[PDB]
């Protein structure tokens, strides 16, 4: 139940432009931000076969995944591959991923407040939005 919302938040981080689909370029920027260096990844989840991943397909893959997954996570965070995650390597991945989620949270706050890009608010609307 509540896990679907968490999966939607994981989906929205990849779907930066918010069109409802994860492109191969949108999947590539996050992988590069994790220190990694692609078409098979998209094709492995695309059930409709249009070349992009929508949320229902992302839900099936993430739900079907729920040991070995944490090992792959350890490998991604262990950048130099020395068998340990140092303070700098943990900080780097969590700062990069944390800042990107903050950006997604900002875009959701702007869309929710009716500005939704290229919009504006005067002082009266700013006070109403920034209080209560």
């Amino acid at each position: 139940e509540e896990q679907i919302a968490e999966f939607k938040e994981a989906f929205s981080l990849f779907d930066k432009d918010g069109d409802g689909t994860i492109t191969t370029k949108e999947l590539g920027t996050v992988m590069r931000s994790l220190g990694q260096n692609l078409q098979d990844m998209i094709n492995e989840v695309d059930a409709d076969g249009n070349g992009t991943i929508d949320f229902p397909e992302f839900l099936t893959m993430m739900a079907r995944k729920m040991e070995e997954e944490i090992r792959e996570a350890f490998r991604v965070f262990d950048k130099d591959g020395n068998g340990y995650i140092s303070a700098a390597e943990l900080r780097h991945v969590m700062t990069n991923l944390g800042e990107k989620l903050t950006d997604e949270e900002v875009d959701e706050m702007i869309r929710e407040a009716g500005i939704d890009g290229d919009g504006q608010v005067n002082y009266e609307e700013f006070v109403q939005m920034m209080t209560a």
Binding site: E6, L34, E72, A73, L101
Partner: peptide
């Protein structure tokens, strides 16, 4: 699976943020 594990890697860090927020 390295593919789903890569997608799961971001989810784990995201869940660590959420669990740390409720504290």
């Amino acid at each position: 699976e390295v593919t789903v594990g890569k997608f799961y890697a971001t989810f784990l860090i995201q869940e660590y943020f959420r669990k740390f927020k409720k504290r």
